[PDB]
């Protein structure tokens, strides 16, 4: 396999190409390995930032909201994430 930080780098590479589907595949794998206790410099909040935006681009609306809530729970001063949460809660009438 690839390491947690390698998979994260793969997902960031896909994201910077505008390839949101492959961003999802890689970041989901990161989350799996982080939850398996694997050592990594990458934090969950950083993964959720890419993943929440990518799943929104793919049309997965309530999951984007769920992941944005989880991101803010782990990084409360993340101003961009707070703006995203306001957007998704207004979009989905979940305020």
């Amino acid at each position: 396999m690839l390491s947690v930080d390698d998979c994260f780098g793969m997902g960031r590479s896909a994201y910077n190409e505008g390839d949101y589907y492959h961003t999802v595949l890689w970041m989901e794998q990161v989350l799996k390995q982080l939850d398996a206790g694997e050592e990594a410099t990458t934090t969950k909040s950083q993964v959720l930032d890419y993943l929440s935006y990518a799943v929104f681009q793919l049309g997965d609306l309530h999951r984007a909201l769920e992941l944005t809530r989880r991101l803010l729970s782990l990084d409360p001063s993340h101003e961009r994430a707070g703006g995203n949460l306001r957007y998704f809660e207004q979009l989905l009438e979940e305020e």
Partner: peptide, 9 residues
Amino acid sequence: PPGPRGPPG
């Protein structure tokens, strides 16, 4: 437009 913003890079 009105929408979320992802990581800049």
